[PDB]
Amino acid sequence: TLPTTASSSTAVASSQLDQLANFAYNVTTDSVAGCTLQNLRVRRDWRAFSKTQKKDYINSVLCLQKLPSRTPAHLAPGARTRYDDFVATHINQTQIIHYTGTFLAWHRYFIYEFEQALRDECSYTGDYPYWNWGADADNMEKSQVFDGSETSMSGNGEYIPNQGDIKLLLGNYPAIDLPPGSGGGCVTSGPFKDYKLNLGPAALSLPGGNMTAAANPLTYNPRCMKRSLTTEILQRYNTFPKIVELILDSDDIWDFQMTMQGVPGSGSIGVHGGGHYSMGGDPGRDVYVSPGDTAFWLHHGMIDRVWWIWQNLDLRKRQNAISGTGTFMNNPASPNTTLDTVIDLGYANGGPIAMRDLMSTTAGPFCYVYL
Amino acid sequence: TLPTTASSSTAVASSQLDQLANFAYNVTTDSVAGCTLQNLRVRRDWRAFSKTQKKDYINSVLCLQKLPSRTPAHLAPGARTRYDDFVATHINQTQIIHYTGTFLAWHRYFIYEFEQALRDECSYTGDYPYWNWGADADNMEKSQVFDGSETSMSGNGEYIPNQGDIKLLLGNYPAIDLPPGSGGGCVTSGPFKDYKLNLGPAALSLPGGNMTAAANPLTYNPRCMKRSLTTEILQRYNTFPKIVELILDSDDIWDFQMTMQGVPGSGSIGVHGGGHYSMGGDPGRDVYVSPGDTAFWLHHGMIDRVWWIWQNLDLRKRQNAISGTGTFMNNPASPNTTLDTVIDLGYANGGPIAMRDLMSTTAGPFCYVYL
Ligand SMILES: *[C@@H]1O[C@H](CO)[C@@H](O[C@@H]2O[C@H](CO)[C@@H](O[C@@H]3O[C@H](CO)[C@@H](O)[C@H](O)[C@@H]3O)[C@H](O)[C@H]2NC(C)=O)[C@H](O)[C@H]1NC(C)=O
Ligand SMILES: *[C@@H]1O[C@H](CO)[C@@H](O[C@@H]2O[C@H](CO)[C@@H](O)[C@H](O)[C@H]2NC(C)=O)[C@H](O)[C@H]1NC(C)=O
Ligand SMILES: *[C@@H]1O[C@H](CO)[C@@H](O)[C@H](O)[C@H]1NC(C)=O
Ligand SMILES: *[C@@H]1O[C@H](CO)[C@@H](O)[C@H](O)[C@H]1NC(C)=O
Ligand SMILES: *[C@@H]1O[C@H](CO)[C@@H](O)[C@H](O)[C@H]1NC(C)=O
Ligand SMILES: *[C@@H]1O[C@H](CO)[C@@H](O)[C@H](O)[C@H]1NC(C)=O
Ligand SMILES: *[C@@H]1O[C@H](CO)[C@@H](O)[C@H](O)[C@H]1NC(C)=O
Ligand SMILES: *[C@H]1O[C@H](CO)[C@@H](O)[C@H](O)[C@@H]1O
Ligand SMILES: *[C@H]1O[C@H](CO)[C@@H](O)[C@H](O)[C@@H]1O
Ligand SMILES: [Cu+2]
Ligand SMILES: [Cu+2]
Ligand SMILES: [Cu+2]
Ligand SMILES: [Cu+2]
C-alpha cells in the first residue's frame, strides 16, 4: 500500500518517494504496448550514472556549446552556439512561462527537445540524467552534480568574502532572505570553466539587494559562468520531506504547481526556486537566463519526474489536469490555459504543439519513464 | 486653508476638489514667475469648451484617424492611421506601463505627444480637454463626453438585452462583478459612428466572465467601436468623495498610484479602473487596446490632473517621487524605477526620454497647468 502523508524524518521520506516512484514506474510500463515497451527510454539518477556514462553526457553538452547557432542574427545578436538558442528562447518567453497553465508542460517539452539536440547533433546514446535534491541537501559541495570534478557540471565559484544576504522580491510581497553561499566568483574546476556564457543578464539578483539588468538581454556579452553553492537553501526547500510533501499533499494541479514554484506571500520558493538559487552566481540567480547554467537540465529532469510521479497517483484526474493562464501570475489578466493552447520553443528545436500532446510521457512525441 | 479629510457629501467634496485644484494652480503659476507665464498652456474641463471649440478638438482627432501610420508594416501589420500608431505602442508596452514605477509619467508623456500630433499634423490650436468623472457620476448617459451628439466622443452602443456581468480579476483574489451597462453594441451616433478600430482585441473582458484574445493583436482586424455606458461603475469608484479621498488620504507615491489603479484584495478598481470600465464595450474593456476608445485621452487628462494636484500639495517631497519597478506588479521581478529610467512611445511620436524630465508639468518638454 502507498504512503498517505509525508514523513518528518528524512530517511523515511526517501523511502516513501522511492515507493511512490516505483508505483509511477509500474503504472506507466503496464499500460504501454509509436511508443512501445521496446523503445521506452529510461531517465536515471545522476548517481546511477557510471563515471564513463557521465563523460558521454558532458561531452555531448560540450559539443552543443560548440556548434553554430540556428537563431536569426537580428532576433538575437548575442546567440553564437546551439546551446545559446535554447537559452535565447527561454529568455524570450519567461513572461508567458512560469506561474502559468503551461509552466510544467513547456519545460517538459523544453528538456525533451534539448535531449534531441544531443542525440541528433552531438551523437548521444545514453540516458537523460536528473538531480535528486534531497540526496545532497546537507552538503551540496559534495554532490556529484557540483563536486568540481570532471564528472560534474563544474563546481563552486571562487569564494567572494563578505557577501551580503540575497533578498528576493517577486511581486509586492515581503522579501525572502537567503545566505550568499560559499562561492560567488567564476567557476574553478570542472569541464565548464572555459564555457563562455553569452546572453543576459536580464534580471540577475545580487548579494546585497541589487538586480543587474541589461538594456537588452539578447545582445552579446561573453562572460564566465559563476556559482555560489548554498547548502542552506537546499535544506530549507529541498529535503526529502519537502519533496514528498509536495506530492502527497497537493490534491489538485493548482496546489501542485503553486507549491512547486513557491506560494506567493508564504516565504517559500518551492522545490523549483530552491533548486535554482542554491547554485547561486550567474545565471543561477537569474530567472530569465537560468538555462545558462548547465545544471539546469538535471534540475528540470527532477521537476518533470516529480510531476510525473504526482500525475500517475491518479491518472483518471491528473493526466490532463491544467490550471492557470498565459501570463506570469495572471499579470495582466489573460485567458485560461486549455488543452488546445499551442506553445513553441522558438528556434531551439521542434515546432509548435498543442498542450494535450504534452501531458503524457508515453504519448505525443514522448516515450520515456523515470527510475 | 486646505481640507485634510475627504467628505461624504458629493456637494461639499466637489467644493474641496475645487480648492485643492485652485491651490495647485496657485503654486504652479507662482513658480513659473523656457516656460514662462506668456506661453503657459492651460487644460480645461470638457464642459468649459464652447461648441466650436469642441468640434475643433474632435475634427483634429478625426484627422489623426485618416493620416497614414508611421509604424513599419512588419512591426504592426494592422496599423493604417496615425491614430493606430498610438494604440499600437500602448498594446506593445502594456505590461511595463501599468502597475510600474513609470505608470503616471508614461501616460503624462503619452497624451502630450498625442496632443503634439494634433497640433503639428491636424492644425489644432485649442486646449487639451479632460473628463471630470465626478460631474457625471449621477448619470453617464447625460455626460457631454458620452451623450452621442455632434460634440461627444460618440455615445452609447446598440442595445443588447439580458447581458451577464463583467468579472474582473485584480490580483490573486476573486473576480469583481460589475454590471454590464446600458449598451453593448456598436456606437449609434456621434462623430465616431463610422470610426474603425484596426487592432486588438488583446484581452477583451466580456459579459458573463469570458475574455477574447487575438493570436496577434497587432494584426489587421477592422471593426466598430462598442460602448455600454455604466453609471453605477462611476458611482462606486468615481464620485467626488472618491476623488478627494484619493488625493488627501494618499501619503506617498506608492499609496497614491496604487489607490488610483486599484489595490488587489479590496474590491475597488480605483478611479483609473472606474473610468475605463464605465465606458464598457470594446476596446473599453481591454487593458491593452483601451486608447482605441476616443474618450481615453480626456480620461487620462483627468488622471494627470489628479496627480498634478497631489504633487503640488507637498512639492518638496512629491515633485520627483517614484515607487515601483519596470514590470506589471513586479511580476516577474525587475529593478526599481529611478529618475534615470528611459521610456519611449515606439513610432507614435517623439523619442526616448528619462523620468527626471517628466515629473513636472512646468519642466522638461512640459509647460502646462490645469483649470
Ligand atoms: C515593441 O517593443 C519592442 C521592444 O521591446 C520592439 O522591438 C525592437 O524592434 C527593433 C526594430 O524592429 C529592434 O531593432 C533591432 O536592433 C538590432 C541590434 O543588433 C538589429 O540587429 C536588428 O536588425 C534590429 O534593427 C529591437 O532589437 C527590438 N527590441 C527587442 C527588445 O526585441 C518592437 O519594435 C515594438 N513594436 C512596436 C510595434 O512598437
Ligand atoms: C520572441 O517571441 C516573439 C513572439 O512571442 C517572436 O516574434 C515573432 O517573430 C516571428 C518571426 O520574425 C514573426 O513571424 C511573428 O509575427 C512574431 N510575433 C510577434 C508577436 O512579434 C520573436 O521572434 C521571438 N524571438 C526569439 C529570439 O525567439
Ligand atoms: C511494482 O511492480 C512490481 C511487479 O509488478 C512489484 O513487485 C512491486 O512491488 C511494485 N512496486 C511497488 C512499490 O509495490
Ligand atoms: C548596488 O549595490 C551597491 C553595493 O555593492 C550599492 O552601494 C548601490 O547603491 C546599488 N545600486 C543601486 C542603484 O541601488
Ligand atoms: C489662489 O490665489 C488667489 C489669488 O488672489 C486667491 O484669491 C485664492 O484664494 C487662492 N486659492 C487658494 C486655494 O490658495
Ligand atoms: C478560468 O480557470 C479558473 C481555474 O483556475 C476557473 O476557476 C475559472 O472559472 C475560469 N474562468 C472562466 C471564465 O472560464
Ligand atoms: C528597490 O527599492 C527598495 C527601496 O525601499 C529597496 O529596499 C530594494 O532593495 C530595491 N530593490 C531592487 C530589486 O532594486
Ligand atoms: C533529515 O535531514 C534533512 C536535511 O536533509 C533535515 O532537514 C531534517 O530535519 C531531517 O533531519
Ligand atoms: C453629488 O451627488 C449626489 C448624488 O449622489 C447629489 O445628491 C448631490 O446633489 C451632488 O450632485
Ligand atoms: Cu523556465
Ligand atoms: Cu526551472
Ligand atoms: Cu496605459
Ligand atoms: Cu488608463
XYZ file of N, CA and C in Angstrom, chain B residues 89-243:
465
model
N 1.691 51.202 -29.889
C 2.732 51.287 -28.870
C 2.168 51.035 -27.476
N 0.870 51.282 -27.278
C 0.253 51.001 -25.986
C 0.043 49.505 -25.792
N -0.438 48.813 -26.830
C -0.560 47.359 -26.767
C 0.804 46.727 -26.521
N 1.807 47.161 -27.290
C 3.155 46.610 -27.186
C 3.706 46.726 -25.771
N 3.426 47.840 -25.094
C 4.091 48.181 -23.842
C 3.187 48.072 -22.622
N 2.015 47.443 -22.747
C 1.044 47.468 -21.655
C 1.610 46.847 -20.379
N 2.409 45.789 -20.507
C 2.882 45.067 -19.332
C 4.067 45.735 -18.641
N 4.509 46.906 -19.102
C 5.597 47.615 -18.434
C 5.205 49.064 -18.164
N 3.915 49.385 -18.293
C 3.463 50.762 -18.097
C 2.291 50.838 -17.127
N 1.783 49.692 -16.682
C 0.712 49.651 -15.694
C 1.203 48.901 -14.465
N 0.931 49.464 -13.285
C 1.440 48.940 -12.015
C 2.966 48.882 -12.017
N 3.583 49.878 -12.638
C 5.027 50.050 -12.667
C 5.384 51.352 -11.960
N 6.681 51.662 -11.935
C 7.098 52.971 -11.470
C 6.871 54.076 -12.474
N 6.710 53.722 -13.747
C 6.561 54.684 -14.830
C 5.109 54.979 -15.179
N 4.149 54.333 -14.508
C 2.752 54.392 -14.934
C 2.268 55.826 -15.104
N 2.446 56.653 -14.072
C 1.957 58.025 -14.138
C 2.750 58.854 -15.143
N 4.077 58.714 -15.146
C 4.901 59.535 -16.026
C 4.782 59.108 -17.484
N 4.598 57.810 -17.742
C 4.465 57.347 -19.120
C 3.203 57.899 -19.771
N 2.098 57.939 -19.026
C 0.843 58.417 -19.592
C 0.810 59.935 -19.709
N 1.501 60.648 -18.816
C 1.655 62.087 -18.992
C 2.385 62.396 -20.293
N 3.427 61.620 -20.604
C 4.138 61.786 -21.866
C 3.321 61.267 -23.043
N 2.529 60.215 -22.825
C 1.727 59.636 -23.900
C 0.726 60.646 -24.449
N -0.048 61.278 -23.564
C -1.080 62.201 -24.021
C -0.467 63.504 -24.518
N 0.716 63.867 -24.017
C 1.379 65.071 -24.508
C 1.801 64.909 -25.962
N 2.382 63.759 -26.309
C 2.772 63.525 -27.694
C 1.557 63.328 -28.590
N 0.471 62.775 -28.044
C -0.789 62.739 -28.777
C -1.303 64.150 -29.033
N -1.188 65.026 -28.032
C -1.542 66.428 -28.221
C -0.636 67.088 -29.253
N 0.657 66.754 -29.232
C 1.583 67.305 -30.218
C 1.250 66.830 -31.626
N 0.732 65.606 -31.760
C 0.324 65.123 -33.074
C -0.899 65.878 -33.580
N -1.813 66.240 -32.677
C -2.963 67.046 -33.070
C -2.527 68.427 -33.548
N -1.529 69.012 -32.885
C -1.130 70.381 -33.197
C -0.355 70.455 -34.507
N 0.614 69.561 -34.694
C 1.569 69.694 -35.786
C 1.115 69.047 -37.087
N 0.144 68.131 -37.044
C -0.321 67.456 -38.247
C -1.786 67.694 -38.576
N -2.603 68.135 -37.616
C -4.019 68.370 -37.871
C -4.450 69.775 -37.464
N -3.492 70.689 -37.290
C -3.761 72.125 -37.157
C -4.659 72.441 -35.963
N -4.388 71.812 -34.824
C -5.133 72.103 -33.607
C -4.434 73.208 -32.828
N -5.197 74.230 -32.439
C -4.671 75.331 -31.645
C -5.385 75.499 -30.313
N -6.363 74.652 -30.004
C -7.116 74.765 -28.775
C -6.397 74.144 -27.591
N -7.155 73.960 -26.516
C -6.626 73.419 -25.275
C -6.841 71.910 -25.202
N -6.038 71.263 -24.364
C -6.219 69.841 -24.097
C -7.368 69.650 -23.111
N -8.358 68.824 -23.434
C -9.504 68.642 -22.542
C -9.339 67.449 -21.609
N -10.087 67.492 -20.508
C -10.169 66.361 -19.597
C -11.626 66.103 -19.230
N -11.861 64.929 -18.649
C -13.193 64.469 -18.274
C -13.262 64.391 -16.754
N -14.062 65.269 -16.153
C -14.266 65.277 -14.706
C -15.328 64.236 -14.376
N -14.888 63.043 -13.953
C -15.829 61.952 -13.704
C -16.862 62.332 -12.651
N -16.446 63.081 -11.627
C -17.338 63.376 -10.518
C -18.596 64.115 -10.927
N -18.546 64.845 -12.042
C -19.713 65.582 -12.503
C -20.713 64.704 -13.241
N -20.287 63.546 -13.746
C -21.164 62.655 -14.492
C -21.486 61.368 -13.747
N -21.043 61.231 -12.496
C -21.291 60.003 -11.750
C -22.772 59.763 -11.487
N -23.618 60.787 -11.613
C -25.040 60.610 -11.342
C -25.837 60.166 -12.563
N -25.305 60.357 -13.774
C -25.863 59.767 -14.991
C -24.871 59.952 -16.133
N -24.142 58.886 -16.465
C -23.154 58.949 -17.537
C -23.801 59.199 -18.895
N -25.061 58.793 -19.070
C -25.734 58.992 -20.348
C -26.048 60.460 -20.619
N -25.997 61.315 -19.597
C -26.159 62.753 -19.770
C -24.839 63.475 -20.001
N -23.714 62.774 -19.883
C -22.407 63.414 -19.952
C -22.189 64.078 -21.304
N -21.560 65.256 -21.278
C -21.158 65.910 -22.516
C -20.100 65.112 -23.265
N -19.383 64.226 -22.572
C -18.427 63.355 -23.242
C -19.137 62.202 -23.946
N -20.295 61.767 -23.436
C -20.873 60.489 -23.841
C -22.336 60.585 -24.269
N -22.843 61.774 -24.592
C -24.255 61.867 -24.954
C -24.528 61.524 -26.413
N -23.500 61.222 -27.202
C -23.715 60.812 -28.577
C -24.110 61.917 -29.528
N -23.837 63.170 -29.183
C -24.185 64.292 -30.039
C -23.002 64.638 -30.942
N -23.103 65.766 -31.650
C -22.004 66.207 -32.504
C -20.762 66.542 -31.689
N -20.939 66.948 -30.431
C -19.840 67.381 -29.575
C -19.470 66.338 -28.526
N -19.624 65.059 -28.846
C -19.258 63.976 -27.949
C -18.198 63.102 -28.607
N -17.634 62.195 -27.816
C -16.823 61.105 -28.352
C -17.687 59.925 -28.778
N -18.800 60.212 -29.460
C -19.911 59.285 -29.654
C -20.495 58.886 -28.302
N -21.614 58.169 -28.309
C -22.298 57.893 -27.061
C -22.390 56.428 -26.698
N -23.610 55.962 -26.444
C -23.833 54.584 -26.050
C -23.861 53.674 -27.276
N -23.828 52.366 -27.017
C -23.880 51.371 -28.062
C -25.280 50.804 -28.252
N -25.404 49.955 -29.270
C -26.688 49.331 -29.555
C -27.105 48.415 -28.411
N -28.412 48.359 -28.171
C -28.938 47.589 -27.051
C -28.672 46.101 -27.239
N -28.167 45.465 -26.186
C -28.049 44.010 -26.127
C -28.752 43.550 -24.856
N -29.854 42.817 -24.963
C -30.674 42.534 -23.783
C -30.113 41.414 -22.920
N -30.424 41.503 -21.627
C -30.184 40.440 -20.648
C -28.740 39.936 -20.693
N -27.804 40.865 -20.537
C -26.392 40.518 -20.558
C -25.913 40.116 -19.170
N -24.879 39.272 -19.141
C -24.263 38.884 -17.892
C -23.319 39.948 -17.365
N -22.827 39.718 -16.152
C -21.966 40.691 -15.503
C -20.536 40.594 -16.032
N -19.743 41.612 -15.707
C -18.326 41.659 -16.045
C -17.533 41.175 -14.840
N -16.687 40.170 -15.052
C -15.866 39.590 -13.993
C -14.434 40.081 -14.169
N -13.962 40.887 -13.220
C -12.633 41.485 -13.273
C -11.733 40.816 -12.246
N -10.642 40.219 -12.714
C -9.621 39.671 -11.833
C -8.586 40.754 -11.552
N -8.417 41.094 -10.274
C -7.484 42.130 -9.827
C -6.633 41.519 -8.719
N -5.514 40.910 -9.100
C -4.682 40.200 -8.152
C -5.165 38.783 -7.927
N -4.496 38.104 -6.994
C -4.840 36.724 -6.649
C -6.030 36.734 -5.688
N -7.177 37.116 -6.234
C -8.391 37.331 -5.463
C -9.583 36.999 -6.347
N -10.760 36.777 -5.759
C -11.946 36.500 -6.578
C -12.293 37.677 -7.479
N -13.095 37.386 -8.499
C -13.410 38.382 -9.511
C -14.379 39.429 -8.973
N -14.134 40.683 -9.338
C -15.040 41.776 -9.003
C -16.135 41.843 -10.059
N -17.387 41.873 -9.612
C -18.540 41.852 -10.503
C -19.013 43.276 -10.765
N -19.044 43.663 -12.043
C -19.593 44.936 -12.475
C -20.840 44.711 -13.319
N -21.845 45.583 -13.212
C -22.993 45.480 -14.108
C -22.576 45.760 -15.542
N -23.253 45.159 -16.522
C -22.792 45.236 -17.913
C -23.169 46.511 -18.653
N -23.737 47.513 -17.987
C -24.059 48.761 -18.649
C -25.340 48.694 -19.462
N -25.698 49.844 -20.033
C -26.965 50.019 -20.730
C -26.823 49.994 -22.249
N -25.682 49.552 -22.770
C -25.489 49.470 -24.206
C -25.012 48.104 -24.655
N -23.837 48.048 -25.279
C -23.248 46.776 -25.647
C -22.771 46.678 -27.082
N -23.592 47.137 -28.026
C -23.281 47.033 -29.435
C -22.435 48.190 -29.936
N -22.360 48.295 -31.261
C -21.646 49.401 -31.887
C -22.281 50.729 -31.493
N -21.469 51.788 -31.506
C -21.969 53.107 -31.140
C -22.969 53.585 -32.186
N -23.971 54.333 -31.726
C -25.145 54.649 -32.527
C -25.112 56.033 -33.159
N -24.290 56.944 -32.652
C -24.296 58.320 -33.131
C -22.917 58.920 -32.878
N -22.843 60.247 -32.867
C -21.608 60.934 -32.579
C -20.628 60.885 -33.732
N -19.582 61.715 -33.659
C -18.617 61.802 -34.765
C -17.733 60.575 -34.942
N -17.938 59.497 -34.182
C -17.139 58.285 -34.335
C -17.995 57.070 -34.672
N -19.209 57.290 -35.185
C -20.078 56.174 -35.545
C -19.441 55.296 -36.616
N -18.719 55.905 -37.556
C -18.091 55.188 -38.658
C -16.589 55.009 -38.461
N -16.097 55.199 -37.240
C -14.679 55.043 -36.953
C -14.346 53.571 -36.743
N -13.212 53.146 -37.294
C -12.811 51.745 -37.313
C -11.614 51.537 -36.396
N -11.764 50.651 -35.416
C -10.608 50.100 -34.726
C -9.977 49.029 -35.599
N -8.650 49.059 -35.704
C -7.928 48.137 -36.568
C -7.058 47.150 -35.805
N -6.955 47.282 -34.486
C -6.059 46.455 -33.695
C -6.829 45.801 -32.558
N -6.210 44.786 -31.963
C -6.857 44.006 -30.937
C -7.936 43.115 -31.518
N -8.724 42.463 -30.650
C -8.637 42.536 -29.186
C -7.442 41.778 -28.616
N -6.807 42.351 -27.594
C -5.704 41.684 -26.917
C -6.174 40.899 -25.699
N -7.115 41.458 -24.938
C -7.689 40.790 -23.776
C -8.999 41.465 -23.390
N -10.049 41.233 -24.174
C -11.310 41.954 -24.025
C -12.214 41.217 -23.045
N -12.497 41.850 -21.910
C -13.431 41.282 -20.948
C -14.843 41.291 -21.522
N -15.547 40.171 -21.374
C -16.870 40.010 -21.954
C -17.920 39.807 -20.869
N -19.160 40.226 -21.118
C -20.246 39.909 -20.184
C -20.399 38.405 -20.013
N -20.571 37.984 -18.763
C -20.592 36.587 -18.407
C -19.282 36.066 -17.855
N -18.185 36.796 -18.055
C -16.902 36.444 -17.482
C -15.860 35.953 -18.463
N -16.191 35.822 -19.744
C -15.221 35.339 -20.713
C -14.318 36.477 -21.184
N -13.246 36.102 -21.879
C -12.302 37.066 -22.422
C -11.897 36.640 -23.823
N -11.889 37.594 -24.748
C -11.413 37.366 -26.103
C -9.988 37.884 -26.235
N -9.146 37.104 -26.907
C -7.759 37.481 -27.153
C -7.374 37.007 -28.543
N -6.954 37.937 -29.394
C -6.436 37.556 -30.696
C -5.089 36.857 -30.538
N -4.751 36.028 -31.529
C -3.449 35.370 -31.517
C -2.323 36.393 -31.598
N -2.477 37.397 -32.461
C -1.561 38.535 -32.522
C -2.411 39.794 -32.652
N -2.579 40.557 -31.567
C -3.473 41.724 -31.616
C -2.952 42.877 -32.459
N -1.720 42.811 -32.957
C -1.178 43.858 -33.811
C -1.464 43.620 -35.290
N -2.277 42.621 -35.620
C -2.665 42.364 -36.998
C -3.986 43.062 -37.320
N -4.268 43.176 -38.615
C -5.425 43.933 -39.079
C -6.723 43.247 -38.665
N -7.611 44.011 -38.024
C -8.889 43.488 -37.535
C -9.882 44.637 -37.430
N -10.331 45.172 -38.569
C -11.207 46.349 -38.531
C -12.584 46.015 -37.980
N -13.089 46.899 -37.120
C -14.408 46.720 -36.527
C -14.870 48.037 -35.917
N -16.162 48.090 -35.606
C -16.759 49.250 -34.964
C -16.266 49.384 -33.526
N -16.438 50.580 -32.969
C -16.223 50.794 -31.545
C -17.525 50.529 -30.804
N -17.459 49.673 -29.790
C -18.621 49.326 -28.989
C -18.567 50.038 -27.644
N -19.746 50.332 -27.102
C -19.858 51.035 -25.835
C -21.053 50.506 -25.059
N -20.948 50.580 -23.727
C -22.028 50.210 -22.814
C -21.839 51.057 -21.553
N -22.364 52.281 -21.601
C -22.191 53.223 -20.502
C -22.796 52.664 -19.220
N -22.046 52.778 -18.123
C -22.399 52.161 -16.843
C -22.237 53.205 -15.741
N -23.342 53.869 -15.393
C -23.300 54.907 -14.367
C -22.919 54.329 -13.007
N -23.373 53.109 -12.711
C -23.115 52.514 -11.403
C -21.623 52.335 -11.143
N -20.840 52.047 -12.185
C -19.397 51.906 -12.008
C -18.779 53.234 -11.588
N -19.207 54.336 -12.210
C -18.758 55.650 -11.764
C -19.249 55.954 -10.355
N -20.449 55.485 -10.006
C -20.969 55.704 -8.660
C -20.126 54.991 -7.613
N -19.578 53.824 -7.953
C -18.819 53.047 -6.981
C -17.420 53.612 -6.768
N -16.792 54.138 -7.823
C -15.375 54.470 -7.762
C -15.003 55.871 -8.229
N -15.937 56.669 -8.754
C -15.555 57.931 -9.382
C -16.437 59.098 -8.949
N -17.000 59.042 -7.746
C -17.688 60.213 -7.229
C -16.674 61.201 -6.654
N -17.137 62.428 -6.416
C -16.264 63.435 -5.817
C -15.679 62.999 -4.478
N -16.419 62.343 -3.571
C -15.755 61.792 -2.377
C -14.633 60.824 -2.707
N -14.792 60.008 -3.753
C -13.754 59.043 -4.101
C -12.514 59.720 -4.670
N -12.680 60.866 -5.332
C -11.542 61.557 -5.927
C -10.761 62.322 -4.866
